[PDB]
């Protein structure tokens, strides 16, 4: 029956309709949503393509109820209730939801525009106006060399060293003695991790 | 009086509580169509406790669609026996079969059933104190003994009989027994229960018990395609169509109250509360609201209507007003006066809007029937309706008298609602209190609730013959004793005014005489008791025995584990009384050795056996045992879940939860999982399960 | 097609008023309702052809990958134009070409 | 690739006109295969209409819910099925009796128009339109998407007892419905063959299933020109059909019990 | 509360001590209440 | 029109039923076998052309040769239900008739479907055997198909001789299901064995045997 | 979007950053800057004119 469009986001248990997340980002009216998706009012076919999505996404009206709706399915525990479930949903929308476009407030318009662009591209592909993307296209592929791999491994090892030195400082403050910071850190962590990963080829701890 | 619309309301609001009850056909194993042995596993989930309401079984006028018509009481007894084996076969309990019979209930329930019997009036032979119940008790006793002695699977079954002599309302005895079990610290909190009843009110009764592992068996009302054609032409069909009342296995339904508990947890969690939201207390308040909307005790409120979704109206009202409260409306059997005062005040503000809406709804309905096919004139839509109503009902023109009567209405109504709440949560608090008026007041009258005082008088259960003559009308004097007949129908009696042949009928703006107002004078206890005690001395010994209340009976099998211990104590050490507490069967109470019971005697069927009805052979008393039973002493029982309560598996999956907020399957019955808590957030189990 | 709400900026849906026996457009995000001037409610045709030229741009002339023909342009009579097949990727799309002139900046067919 | 091979009668196989008639009569055709345009209009007046093009038509017909469902067909595809629009309207009426009032234009109309009314109703009208488009079947055996004519060369003895080649006509149909095809008059029900041996067993029997499966395996083996002795394939098909039903070629002791 | 691998390690180090304490006196069951950095009760778990 | 097609299909079903009865060892007159479509229409269809399903009901008796070969071949009755959707009074009358005049096997033919009540009621006509057939399934005689070799039901003595010759148990023979269309056509029973003569490209003729499940 | 029916969207490293009116001079200048060495030679500049 209805040809609905849904979004799969991290840290949720099931898909969410596009109108729901659009309301969650902070655009309530349908006209603004259509203006974000569509770019030509004469394209009535694409306009009615998403009409089922418009009509099914009606029980959600404003931003707060959308945030409650998305936080309801956001896995985690139960009993959080609205007063902080809305905060958790806002955090899920801010970080881990398109982190590359932005990670700070005041740039949600960019996120809405990119989401509209993605939905428009999907609709153009579905309306047979553009060929589906070829996943064999070598121009849309990358080769990780020693640089990025060593960078990721060093990031992991350095956060491990940071946690270890934080624990050592917390333990040493209780004794209240002047630490030299030279015997505090264990240089064997980074060296051992890098040596093991390079020797065995199993990338990771 | 009870409404299946409440069942309709639950179906149209919470449809996931319904299951169609797998009919226990004979099991075909390796080509053998074995009749379902009672020891065979139940394909409908095992049940621990099964409480029977005999008012739903032995009561022919409740099911007059077919033609039982037993000319002899033998046919009645045998048919009731067969129905009992059918229901216990399809339910298959394992621990306790509480056979509960109606007795003498408190005074307000006496008024309710007095109205019921007056409008109802052998169909009328089902009433405690009559010889019909006298034979019924003995017949049930013999049937229980026969089943315990004969069925190999009934070794661990103990049958507790509360005959018509024992006072108490039918389901009230189950409630008292449940509270008595709760009062024992050794009670098992996971003991699943089930009550075979027809009244929808039992739903809330389950919520009264605060035992989530509770279910109700009912007849499938939605699926009767009733026919009354010739008795021989049903031979045409064998599978699709049969005689739906005599030759077809009647379908049933199961109402699981744990799913309803999960629901009421969902939609009653209102946002922005000054105090933490408790699902227990909120459920108690919801049951309170359901009782306020209408019950067999209190009269009909002139603003709340069940089929007009007044339950939903009050749920919404609670939703708006709870954020402004500092506490719940009621707590563990007692009322919080300010909270209920504020809620009634909010409904008073909404009263004018509700009355106007009812006026337009009535006019639109009348317009609809126009195209589809004591002088009234109150004009509730017009202003001044309260004054005209009070002038019509009371014929008193004094505004001060009306105001004082309204204040007394408020105080008596608060006392009665508290009485009903304590009656359903803490056992009977008063056997003598009754509501002293025929009508319910307006919510606008509920002001200054903290000033009013609450009091009760416990008293004693009424005499069976006194109660019979207080409940039997002049048209059914056959069951009433001939000695008191002169006190009931003779015009020279000092209490003849209590039983007028013709009484005023108050329609109260209703639509069907089923829910009309039977305006009748209230019974004066003093002169009535004096008159009945004047002629009480002329009764015979059998009549006096039938006018004497007694204690509970427990019947136990010879092969049962608790039988040798009871023998070794009572019949060897000579101890007159013994204390149970918890046992292997879950029963608890005081055991008295029965002297009337003969150890070497033989128990014979009190029913003339009829051929083709599985002739009952006589069985000696050597093969079972019977004791006098009492419960633990009455105590103040809290309304909260017990420790170690294991929840079931959640039936809802993110669909009903969203829909309610925004406008076989037998695995959801038992205690799924072993932990009484559930993992969440950052626990060890939660973190292991999530990743 | 369809209209938007004048103050709600919301989606309008058709409905009937029987006191007047008429068709109107209404928004239940609001209470506004306006006179519908067309009894048409829905269109669906199984045979579709639109999407032939698709997104042609005035900058298509400087595309180096497109082949350049020598066809005589109709109105400006130029002898320099590019050509390309239909942009619709439907399975039964015709192979007839569209010719865009580099002088007058317009497209024409091969008829 | 479900497929049916249909052999025509002796006199039909030598003629192309009767064979084309049979092919037209067997090809499945539903409402969607002929309908072109579907519309929903607001038509409050029962006697008259809002649409100008249907004015005289209602005057030709008459002489409720106001929502009207309008159906327009394609003339070429309409005539290509050798049907009449009148019997199409009759079928549309009889599938839903008189609860859905239906009227049809004249056969000579420039536009083939069918108007339906029922006696909020947008959603039910849409679902009824979908049901009409997806269920209303006009002509043909269900499950037959396409039929192809094929010329077959068969060796037949002459009056002198000499074998000679002869060219006849037959049909190859996408989709499998063996019983209905065999029941069609003008079709040689004693020689109809299918490449789906499961429904061959469900229709013909176990022995015919063995024969058909041997034919299929022989075709697969001999497509490239390789030769395999008949006895091996006969043994394989006998193993596969020995139990009275098809058996797919696909996947106790205490010492082994303790060894596990 | 638990949010990382070191959290399981510390929790099972505490679990060993509490299990030893219950095993000494023969306590058949153990119950934990989980608190965050704000001393707010988060979860309650039971073990044998 | 459609009425002519319906009458033709009904006549084809009647011819297939007669062929099955003849193949089951019963005696059918040559005139009954050679009843043309026009004669069937004249003797069955009325002025408006509707058929009379009660008229095609008939009684058949085994031939003396078949009775000698198969001693268990009793009387056979064939009835066609008038109603498209069968009313259960039809086979109620069927059952009481079979009981009252003691027919061995009765074959009931329905048009669209039979309610499961009658389906599980018809086995209670012991010792008589009742078999059901859909009228649609009887349009085409599948026994005349090229891919279907001839099946001949073996007598008890022939079956015993076969088992002795091959030194077999009853379970070691190739099996055929009771719901197999050929088995339904022949009216097989459990334990009975059919001989199949089959064209073979290595020996010309081949003989096989299949025992009903 | 109503007035910008002819504007060309600009993507940097896979994220939409803005729109431009005349892209021919923009791409010419960017290509000239990359060729002159002002921009890193490995920076990919692509102008897909179809959309
Ligand atoms: Zn609006
Ligand atoms: Zn030009």
Automatic annotation (TrEMBL), chain B:
- Where does the Xrn1 helical domain lie? 277-647
Show where the Xrn1 N-terminal domain sits: 1-220
Work out whether the entry's keyword set contains Cell cycle: no
Q: Name one GO molecular function term.
A: 5'-3' RNA exonuclease activity
Q: Which InterPro entries match?
A: 5_3_exoribonuclease, Xrn1_helical, Xrn1_N, Xrn2/3/4
According to its UniProt entry, the protein's GO biological process terms are: DNA-templated transcription termination; mRNA processing; nuclear-transcribed mRNA catabolic process; rRNA processing
Q: Where can this protein be found?
A: Nucleus
Protein keywords: Coiled coil, Exonuclease, Hydrolase, mRNA processing, Nuclease, Nucleus, rRNA processing, Transcription, Transcription regulation, Transcription termination
Domain of life from the UniProt record: Eukaryota
Gene3D superfamilies from the xrefs?
Answer: 1.25.40.1050, 3.40.50.12390
Give a GO cellular-component term: nucleus
The EC number on file is 3.1.13.-
Q: Which Pfam families match?
A: XRN_M (PF17846), XRN_N (PF03159)
Is rRNA processing among the key words of this record? yes
Q: What class of enzyme is it?
A: hydrolase
Query: What is its biological role?
Result: Possesses 5'->3' exoribonuclease activity. Required for the processing of nuclear mRNA and rRNA precursors. May promote the termination of transcription by RNA polymerase II. Essential for vegetative cell growth and chromosome segregation.
**Complexes and interactors:** Interacts with RAI1; the interaction is direct, stabilizes RAT1 protein structure and may stimulate its exoribonuclease activity. The interaction also stimulates RAI1 pyrophosphohydrolase activity, probably by recruiting it to mRNA substrates.
> Which family does this protein fall into?
Belongs to the 5'-3' exonuclease family. XRN2/RAT1 subfamily.
Q: Which PANTHER family match?
A: 5'-3' EXORIBONUCLEASE 2, 5'->3' EXORIBONUCLEASE
* Protein name, UniProt field: 5'-3' exoribonuclease
Q: Which organism is it from?
A: Komagataella phaffii (strain ATCC 76273 / CBS 7435 / CECT 11047 / NRRL Y-11430 / Wegner 21-1) (Yeast)
UniProtKB/TrEMBL annotation, chain C:
Instruction: Identify the keywords attached in UniProt to this record, alphabetized.
Output: DNA-directed RNA polymerase, Metal-binding, Nucleus, Transcription, Zinc, Zinc-finger
Give me the residues that bind Zn(2+) 1, please: 5-6, 8, 27, 30
Q: Which residues bind Zn(2+) 6?
A: 27
Positions with a binding annotation for Zn(2+) 5: 7, 30
Q: Where does Zn(2+) 4 bind?
A: 7
The residues that hold Zn(2+) 13 are: 103
Protein residues bound to Zn(2+) 8: 73, 76
Task: Tell me the compartments it is located in.
Answer: Nucleus, Nucleolus
Enumerate the residues binding Zn(2+) 7: 27, 30
Instruction: Provide the binding site for Zn(2+) 12.
Output: 76, 104
Q: Give the binding site residues for Zn(2+) 3.
A: 5, 30
Tell me which residues bind Zn(2+) 2.
5, 8, 27, 30, 73, 76, 101, 104
Sites binding Zn(2+) 11 sit at 76, 101
One of its GO biological process terms is:
transcription-coupled nucleotide-excision repair
The residues the record assigns to binding Zn(2+) 9 are 73, 76, 101, 104
What protein family is recorded?
Answer: Belongs to the archaeal rpoM/eukaryotic RPA12/RPB9/RPC11 RNA polymerase family.
Under the heading PANTHER family, the entry gives: DNA-DIRECTED RNA POLYMERASE, DNA-DIRECTED RNA POLYMERASE II SUBUNIT RPB9
What binding partners and quaternary form does the record give?
A: Component of the RNA polymerase II (Pol II) complex consisting of 12 subunits.
Protein name as it appears in the record: DNA-directed RNA polymerase subunit
Species annotation: Komagataella phaffii (strain ATCC 76273 / CBS 7435 / CECT 11047 / NRRL Y-11430 / Wegner 21-1)
Automatic annotation (TrEMBL), chain E:
**Cellular localisation:** Nucleus
According to its UniProt entry, the function of this protein is described as: Decapping enzyme for NAD-capped RNAs: specifically hydrolyzes the nicotinamide adenine dinucleotide (NAD) cap from a subset of RNAs by removing the entire NAD moiety from the 5'-end of an NAD-capped RNA.
Tell me which family the UniProt entry assigns to this protein: Belongs to the DXO/Dom3Z family.
In Swiss-Prot or TrEMBL terms, this protein is called Decapping nuclease
What is the name of the gene encoding this protein?
RAI1
UniProtKB/TrEMBL annotation, chain F:
**PROSITE patterns, alphabetically?**
RNA_POL_H_23KD
* Domain RNA polymerase subunit H/Rpb5 C-terminal residues, every copy: 140-212
Alphabetically sorted, this entry's keywords are: Nucleus, Transcription
Please tell me the species this chain comes from.
Komagataella phaffii (strain GS115 / ATCC 20864) (Yeast)
Q: What is the lineage of its organism?
A: Eukaryota, Fungi, Dikarya, Ascomycota, Saccharomycotina
Q: Name one GO cellular component term.
A: RNA polymerase III complex
Name-wise, this protein is DNA-directed RNA polymerases I, II, and III subunit RPABC1
User: Which InterPro entries is this protein grouped with?
Assistant: Arch_Rpo5/euc_Rpb5 (IPR014381), RNA_pol_Rpb5_N (IPR005571), RNA_pol_Rpb5_N_sf (IPR036710), RNA_pol_subH/Rpb5_C (IPR000783), RNA_pol_subH/Rpb5_CS (IPR020608), RPB5-like_sf (IPR035913)
Q: Which SUPFAM superfamilies match?
A: Eukaryotic RPB5 N-terminal domain, RPB5-like RNA polymerase subunit
């Amino acid at each position: 029956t209805g040809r609905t469009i849904k979004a799969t986001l991290p840290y949720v248990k099931q898909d969410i309709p596009i109108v729901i997340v659009f309301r969650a980002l902070g655009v309530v009216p349908d006209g603004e949503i259509l203006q974000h998706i569509c770019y030509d009012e004469n394209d009535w076919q694409m306009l009615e393509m998403l009409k089922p999505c418009i009509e099914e996404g009606f029980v959600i009206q404003d931003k707060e109820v959308a945030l409650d709706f998305i936080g309801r399915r956001g896995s985690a525990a139960l009993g959080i209730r609205r007063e902080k479930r809305i905060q958790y949903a806002k955090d899920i929308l801010q970080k881990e939801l398109l982190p590359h476009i932005t990670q700070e407030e005041g740039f949600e318009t960019r996120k809405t525009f990119f989401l509209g662009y993605m939905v428009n591209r999907l609709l153009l592909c579905a309306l047979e106006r553009k060929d589906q993307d070829d996943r064999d296209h070598f121009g849309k592929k990358r080769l990780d060399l020693a640089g990025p791999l060593l960078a990721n491994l060093f990031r992991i090892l350095f956060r491990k060293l940071t946690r270890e030195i934080y624990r050592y400082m917390q333990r040493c403050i209780e004794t209240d003695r002047d630490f030299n910071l030279n015997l505090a850190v264990k240089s064997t962590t980074i060296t051992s991790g890098l040596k093991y990963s390079l020797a065995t080829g199993n990338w990771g701890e | 009086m009870g409404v299946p619309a409440l069942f309709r309301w639950l179906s149209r609001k919470y449809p996931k509580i319904i299951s169609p009850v797998i009919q226990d056909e004979d099991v075909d194993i390796d080509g053998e169509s074995r009749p379902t042995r009672y020891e065979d596993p139940n394909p409908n989930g095992e049940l621990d406790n099964l409480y029977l309401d005999m008012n739903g079984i032995v009561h022919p006028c409740s099911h007059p669609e077919h033609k039982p018509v037993p000319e002899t009481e033998d046919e009645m007894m045998l048919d009731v026996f067969a129905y009992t084996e059918n229901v216990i076969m399809m339910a298959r309990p394992r621990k306790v079969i509480y056979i509960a019979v109606d007795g003498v209930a408190p005074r307000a329930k006496m008024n309710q059933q007095r109205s019921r019997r007056f409008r109802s009036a052998d169909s009328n032979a089902i009433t405690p104190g009559t010889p019909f119940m006298h034979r019924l008790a003995d017949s049930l006793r013999y049937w229980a003994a026969y089943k315990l002695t004969t069925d190999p699977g009934w070794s661990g079954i103990e049958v507790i009989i509360s005959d018509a002599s024992v006072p108490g309302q039918g389901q009230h005895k189950i409630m008292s027994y449940v509270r008595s079990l709760r009062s024992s610290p050794k009670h098992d909190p996971n003991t699943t229960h089930c009550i075979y009843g027809l009244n929808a009110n039992l739903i809330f009764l389950g919520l009264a018990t605060h035992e989530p592992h509770f279910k109700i068996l009912r007849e499938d009302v939605f699926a009767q395609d009733k026919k009354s054609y010739s008795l021989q032409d049903q031979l045409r069909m064998t599978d699709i169509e049969r005689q739906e009342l005599k030759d077809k296995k009647t379908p049933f339904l199961w109402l699981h109250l744990n799913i309803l508990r999960e629901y009421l947890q969902i939609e009653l969690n209102v946002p922005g509360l000054s105090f933490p939201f408790d699902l227990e207390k909120s459920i108690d308040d919801w049951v309170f609201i359901c009782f306020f909307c209408g019950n067999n005790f209190l009269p009909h409120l002139p603003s709340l209507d069940v089929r007009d979704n007044s339950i939903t109206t009050l749920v919404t009202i609670w939703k708006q007003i709870l954020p402004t409260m500092k506490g719940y409306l009621t707590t563990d059997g007692y009322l919080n006066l300010p909270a209920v005062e504020r809620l009634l005040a909010e409904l008073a503000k909404k009263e004018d809007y509700i009355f106007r809406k009812r006026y337009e709804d009535e006019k639109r309905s009348l317009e609809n029937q126009k195209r589809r096919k004591k002088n009234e004139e109150i004009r509730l839509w017009e202003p001044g309706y309260r004054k005209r109503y009070y002038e019509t009902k009371f014929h008193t023109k004094d505004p001060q008298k009306v105001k004082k009567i309204a204040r007394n209405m408020v105080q008596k109504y608060i006392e009665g609602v508290s009485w009903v709440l304590l009656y359903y949560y803490q056992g009977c608090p008063s056997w003598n209190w009754y509501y002293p008026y025929h009508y319910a007041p307006f919510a606008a009258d509920f002001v200054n609730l903290s000033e009013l005082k609450i009091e009760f008088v416990e008293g004693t259960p009424f005499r069976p013959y006194e109660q019979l003559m207080s409940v039997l009308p002049a048209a059914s004097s056959h069951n009433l004793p001939d000695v008191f007949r002169s006190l009931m129908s003779d015009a020279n009696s000092e209490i003849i005014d209590f039983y007028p042949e013709e009484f005023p009928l108050d329609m109260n703006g209703k639509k069907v005489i089923w829910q009309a107002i039977p305006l009748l004078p209230f019974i004066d206890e003093n002169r009535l008791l004096k008159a009945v005690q004047s002629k009480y001395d002329q009764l015979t010994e059998d009549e006096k025995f039938r006018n004497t209340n007694r204690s509970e009976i427990l019947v136990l099998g010879r092969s049962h584990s608790h039988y040798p211990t009871l023998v070794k104590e009572l019949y060897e050490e000579g101890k007159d009384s013994y204390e149970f507490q918890v046992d292997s069967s879950g029963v608890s109470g005081v055991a008295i050795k029965l002297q009337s019971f003969d150890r070497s005697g033989v128990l014979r069927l009190p029913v003339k056996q009829l051929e083709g009805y599985r002739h009952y052979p006589d069985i000696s008393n050597r093969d079972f045992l019977m004791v006098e039973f009492k419960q633990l002493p009455k105590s103040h029982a809290k309304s909260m879940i017990l420790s170690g309560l294991i929840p079931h598996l959640r039936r809802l999956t993110q669909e009903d939860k969203d829909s309610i907020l925004y406008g076989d399957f037998k695995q959801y019955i038992g205690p799924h999982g072993k932990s009484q808590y559930l993992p969440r957030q950052g626990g060890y189990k939660a973190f292991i399960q999530i990743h | 097609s369809f209209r938007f709400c004048l103050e709600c900026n919301n989606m309008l849906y058709p409905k009937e008023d029987k006191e007047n026996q008429r068709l109107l457009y209404s928004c239940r995000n609001c209470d506004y309702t306006e006179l519908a001037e067309d009894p048409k409610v829905y269109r669906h045709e199984l045979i579709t052809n639109i999407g032939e030229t698709a997104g042609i741009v005035d900058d298509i002339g400087q595309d180096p990958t497109l082949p350049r023909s020598d066809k005589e342009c109709p109105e400006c009579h130029s002898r320099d134009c590019v050509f390309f097949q239909s942009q619709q990727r439907r399975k039964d799309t015709n192979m007839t070409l569209f010719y865009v002139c580099l002088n007058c900046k317009k497209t024409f067919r091969d008829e | 690739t479900p497929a049916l091979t249909v052999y025509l009668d002796r006199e039909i196989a030598l003629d192309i006109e009767k064979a084309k008639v049979i092919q037209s009569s067997i090809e499945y055709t539903t409402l969607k295969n002929v309908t072109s345009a579907t519309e929903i209009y607001y038509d409050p007046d029962p006697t008259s209409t809002v649409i100008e093009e249907d004015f005289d038509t209602v005057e030709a017909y008459f002489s409720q819910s106001p929502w009207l469902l309008r159906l327009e067909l394609d003339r070429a595809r309409m005539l290509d099925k050798q049907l009449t629009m009148n019997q199409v309207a009759d079928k549309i009426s009889e599938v839903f009796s008189d609860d859905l009032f239906v009227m049809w234009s004249e056969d000579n109309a420039d536009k083939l128009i069918i108007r339906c009314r029922v006696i909020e109703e947008d959603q039910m009208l849409k679902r009824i339109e979908a049901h009409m488009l997806d269920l209303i079947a006009l002509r043909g055996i269900p499950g037959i998407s396409k039929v192809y004519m094929v010329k077959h060369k068969v060796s037949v003895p002459d009056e002198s007892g000499e074998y000679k080649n002869e060219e006849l006509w037959a049909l190859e149909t996408d989709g499998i419905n063996l019983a209905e095809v065999m029941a069609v008059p003008g079709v040689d029900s004693s020689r109809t063959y299918s490449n789906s041996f499961v429904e061959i067993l469900s229709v013909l029997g176990i022995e015919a299933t063995r024969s058909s499966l041997y034919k299929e395996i022989l075709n697969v083996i001999a497509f490239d020109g390789s030769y395999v002795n008949y006895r091996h394939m006969a043994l394989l098909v006998d193993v596969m059909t020995s139990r009275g039903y098809l058996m797919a070629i696909t996947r106790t002791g205490a010492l082994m019990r303790c060894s596990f | 509360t638990i949010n990382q691998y070191k959290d399981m390690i510390a929790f099972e180090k505490k679990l060993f001590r509490t299990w030893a304490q219950c095993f000494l006196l023969g306590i058949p069951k153990i119950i934990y209440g989980f608190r965050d950095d704000n001393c707010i009760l988060r979860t309650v778990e039971e073990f044998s | 029109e459609d009425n002519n097609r319906i009458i033709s299909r009904l006549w084809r079903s009647f011819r297939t039923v007669k062929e099955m009865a003849a193949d089951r060892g019963y005696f059918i007159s040559q005139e009954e076998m050679d009843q043309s479509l026009e004669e069937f229409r004249s003797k069955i269809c009325d002025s408006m052309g509707n058929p009379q399903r009660k008229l095609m009901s008939f009684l058949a008796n085994p031939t003396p040769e078949a009775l000698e070969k198969y001693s268990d071949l009793g009387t056979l009755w064939v009835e066609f239900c008038d109603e498209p959707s069968v009313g259960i009074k039809t086979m109620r009358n069927f059952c009481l008739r079979i009981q009252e005049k003691n027919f061995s096997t009765g074959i009931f033919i329905y048009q669209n479907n039979i309610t499961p009540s009658a389906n599980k009621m018809i086995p209670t006509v012991s010792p008589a055997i009742i078999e059901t057939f859909q009228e649609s399934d009887l349009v085409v005689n599948i026994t005349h198909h090229e891919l279907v070799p001839k099946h001949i039901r073996l007598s008890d003595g022939e079956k015993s001789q076969l088992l002795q010759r091959y030194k077999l148990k009853e379970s070691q023979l190739p099996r055929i299901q009771r719901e197999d269309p050929v088995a339904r056509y022949l009216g097989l029973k459990r334990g009975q064995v059919v001989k199949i003569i089959r064209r073979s490209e290595t020996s010309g003729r081949y003989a096989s045997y299949r025992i009903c499940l | 979007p109503a007035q910008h029916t002819k504007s060309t969207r600009i993507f940097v490293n896979g994220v939409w950053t803005g729109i431009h009116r005349d892209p021919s001079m923009l791409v010419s200048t960017m290509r000239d800057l990359r060729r002159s060495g002002a921009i890193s030679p490995e920076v990919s500049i692509i102008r897909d004119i179809r959309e």
